Symmetry: D2
Subunit: 215 residues, 4 copies
């Protein structure tokens, strides 16, 4: 179903602090190597008045390298696909709600993303655009009443030396009945390789590998 | 500009757990009585698979009775109007993000509402439709960085006696420079007086009175 | 069982950010009229390096004026008494855990209080003492699994202005089987009347009344 | 100052839901292999009416294997030592506040722990003792206002399935001026190897290793 080589197509519609925007992207990646890359383009609502880094983790766990001992819930879910729902909590009250419906058409993954952020203070690092990079993150994946859950508590490094924490809460629902994995982790590293000035064009890279902890 | 009798026109567009919907309403109210009433109709995405009660607190603090000891920020902001954002944090992980842009057209208040809820468990009271009503609530409205904020922790009474808590975090932004009030309260009471089976037609009643607390 | 006048004697043993301290108190109040006052003296660990305002809300819902229409869980629980636990989460990461065992000895209420605060930043208003007063607060009380719970979301007023928020979560356990009230509220107003300069002696007043939310001249 | 063989002496006294207890322990570590071991004993307030697992993560980041690429804040603090504070937020409202002042006496680490848990429901996995083990954890360490902070988000496994989440927030304060590290991680694993029937005697082990996240297997 899934080759070592797939393509990505996505459109994200949303609003941050009530003001709408839209982004389209095309990208590519390798599911067995856990790596993906994409090019993002702002279509509506640009220039964006908020930090672009609050969107990068919304721009697909099929691009995670899974060992044999860990059940791969996302590669099993195809060709039917899966969707995910997520709440992002920033330590100063900012809230981001995001959804992604992932389907597969041949060799291309298609995303239907919806994003909504509220309560970002105007003097905060997101509205002042004082963010630099997201630190590498560890995700906890576990089953709870028949669904797969994902929790991440990371931080954004602030242009200055500071760190801006965020808590992720994800729910993963496959379109067909698949086997559910056990408690495991997925390590992430997302990186902005290139943009212009107001982020109307963004080159985004991600690297993810699943593991089973220290023991 | 503020009339003893005002009407409301509103359209809400949103999604709960990724599934879109749209609702329109018309109503009227007495801003100096702190009372308002409206008729809401589902236009898209019906029948709703979630409890309708999670939307009623999103369908305007101008309908709050304000005493002269407290600065009335919401009646002061017209005819330019004001907007508010809100995150609703339920105790089982469900998160709802809502925005409202309120303008004034003659004697009619126009709401442009966007709603988005995620991570509502399928076995929880919102998706299982086991909510009865909202309990009466008190909000504290206070200034932080020159903007008005509102905090509520209320609960929904469940079919069987239990209570399902929610915490509100609202940011109120007036369109023009307005006078900021001091730390005060607003008591509220929202009630669904009539509805259809699947809530395609809902009559919603709300009563609010501002005060400055125990002395 | 409860007279129109009751006395208070209390002992607090605790710590903030790991450094111990101690406070004893004597007081008096009117349970039917929701008013109480006490004089607290610091015994150990003074002068206190933290804002005194984080403890005053730990220094009795029996001193809350209850209407006849709402069941009083605390006045009903006597003469055996009740105990309560509380977690306080300030918006800056500061966490306070408090427990209180309330007994009745004649006409005097006796408290056994334990206080522990952690994760208070050295640059914050609690460690640097920039608190002025608690704003008036409302508490919601509801039953959950046979016990009474109390949630309050209040704030502290700051020296230069602004507010410093705190979230309360209280559990009330009566010692005997009493019956549980319905979802109701209690309005609070706590105030430090007089104190010296390191708060080794503090005069504290509180006023509390229960009600049932937003609802005649006769 | 930090030897390949260290001993542990500890006393923890606190209360869960208002009911006091006291625990004594003795142990030994290998501060360079990130492994520690200890045997613990209940002295007051036993038999414990709560799950013992809510205390095990309170029984020393000096027993974490630190590579040279990451600055070691905890090995720098000895022999004068450091202290830490922690709030543990369970997902059903249980809250635990714990503090530990660690000193160094010759070749032995001395702990003075104070623990306080409240709002634990009587029908919950802690008071009903339905916890099995802690899952492996990753902690995030970072500097804020000149001190080192620690964030952990793990779960506890329960009898019959499922997980019971808890969120850790730790503050590390060295007693003397040390060099502050950059954003890094420490992987943890807690396990009770042997215990009694009433958990009056517990043998506890830990293994901790620091790293810097998703980056060595060049095969040479």
């Amino acid at each position: 179903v899934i080759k070592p080589d797939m393509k990505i197509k996505l459109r994200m519609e949303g609003a941050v602090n009530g003001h709408p925007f839209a982004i389209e992207g095309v990208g590519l990646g390798k599911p067995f190597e856990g790596k993906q890359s994409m090019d993002l383009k702002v279509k509506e609502g640009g220039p964006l008045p908020f930090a672009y880094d609050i969107l990068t983790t919304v721009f697909n766990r099929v691009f995670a390298k899974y060992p044999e001992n860990i059940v791969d819930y996302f590669k099993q879910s195809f060709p039917e696909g899966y969707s995910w729902e997520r709440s992002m909590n920033y330590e100063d009250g900012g809230i981001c709600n995001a959804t992604n419906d992932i389907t597969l058409d041949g060799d291309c993954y298609i995303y239907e993303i919806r994003f909504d952020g509220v309560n970002f203070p105007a003097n905060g690092p997101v509205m002042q655009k004082r963010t630099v990079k997201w630190e590498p993150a560890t995700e906890k994946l576990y089953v709870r009443d028949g669904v797969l859950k994902g929790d991440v508590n990371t931080a954004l490094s602030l242009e200055g030396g500071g760190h801006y924490r965020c808590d992720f809460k994800t729910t993963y629902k496959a379109k067909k009945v698949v086997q559910l994995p056990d408690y495991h982790f997925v390590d992430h590293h997302i990186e902005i390789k290139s943009h212009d000035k107001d982020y109307s064009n963004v080159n985004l890279h991600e690297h993810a590998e699943a593991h089973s902890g220290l023991p």
